[PDB]
Amino acid sequence: LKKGEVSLGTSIMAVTFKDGVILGADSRTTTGAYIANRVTDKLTRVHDKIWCCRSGSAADTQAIADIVQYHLELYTSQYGTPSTETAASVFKELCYENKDNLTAGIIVAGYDDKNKGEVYTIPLGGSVHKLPYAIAGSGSTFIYGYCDKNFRENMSKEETVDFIKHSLSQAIKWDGSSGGVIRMVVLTAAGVERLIFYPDEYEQL
């Protein structure tokens, strides 16, 4: 029995654009009402071109993710590079057999060069669902209308970069367990590009 419990920024997303997927997050851990972390890395590589957003309980998500990391390292070396769908199943299996202790809201989003960019969203209790884009956490219902209407496939990188910065910066404002940095992860075949913007920046922009 875990004494106390932990929570994350609960507005997470993977958005498809011109050449892949751009993955976006807010990060913030709190333990009650103590701000355990301003910044966090919850922008998690599970393979070199396949990253994820972790949401739900900090203790639990991190513990799962590490196990997923071990399987997908071993998986690469032996059976060839994963897919987004391959990563997603492994995450799900671990949640489902141990949904008696686990609370993990996962978006796994990765880039493949024959599927293009792929978003697989695994809610609580665990089920694999393929969608062309995702929003998750509990703050996602409130941006459902925005996201659906302005979601467009094959949008310019500059335009997607604005769209994610804006999407979250609105979400974070109206929702209360959201906060800290907005970090973003661009996945194309040229590699992995890392964006961090601090509070004072994104609010304004």
Partner 1 sequence: AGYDRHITIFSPEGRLYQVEYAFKATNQTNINSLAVRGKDCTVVISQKKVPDKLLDPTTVSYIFCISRTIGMVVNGPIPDARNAALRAKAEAAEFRYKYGYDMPCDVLAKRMANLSQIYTQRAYMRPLGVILTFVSVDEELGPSIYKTDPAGYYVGYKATATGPKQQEITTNLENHFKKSKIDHINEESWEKVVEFAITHMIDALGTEFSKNDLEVGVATKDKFFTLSAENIEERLVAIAEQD
Partner 2 sequence: GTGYDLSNSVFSPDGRNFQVEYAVKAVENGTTSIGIKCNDGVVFAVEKLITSKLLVPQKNVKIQVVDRHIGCVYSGLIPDGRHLVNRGREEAASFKKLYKTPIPIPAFADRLGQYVQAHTLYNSVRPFGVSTIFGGVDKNGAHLYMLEPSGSYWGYKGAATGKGRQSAKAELEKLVDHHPEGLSAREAVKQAAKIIYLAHEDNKEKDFELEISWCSLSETNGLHKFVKGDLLQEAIDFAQKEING
**Catalytic annotation present for 10:** yes
- Which two structure tokens, joined as six digits, stand for 139? 């703050």
Binding test (CB under 8 A) with partner 2, winner from 4, 33, 34, 80: 80
Q: Which stretch binds partner 2 (CB under 8 A): 9-17, 50-58, 71-79, 195-203?
A: 71-79
Q: In this structure, are residues 82 and 109 in contact, taking their beta carbons and an 8 Å threshold?
A: no
Binding test (CB under 8 A) with partner 1, winner from 35, 36, 74, 131: 74
CB nearer partner 1, residue 70 or residue 174: 70
Q: In this structure, are residues 143 and 115 in contact, taking their beta carbons and an 8 Å threshold?
A: no
Does position 83 bind partner 2 by CB under 8 A? yes
Q: Would you report the helix, strand and coil content of the chain in percent, each value rounded to 5?
A: 35, 35, 30
CB nearer partner 2, residue 25 or residue 94: 94
Half-sphere exposure (CA, 13 Å, Cβ side) for 65? 26
Q: What number of chain residues touch partner 1 (CB under 8 A)?
A: 10
CB of 61 to partner 2, least distance (A): 21
Binding test (CB under 8 A) with partner 1, winner from 5, 35, 41, 67: 67
**Measured between alpha carbons, how far is residue 101 from residues 48, 138, 175 in Å?**
29, 19, 26
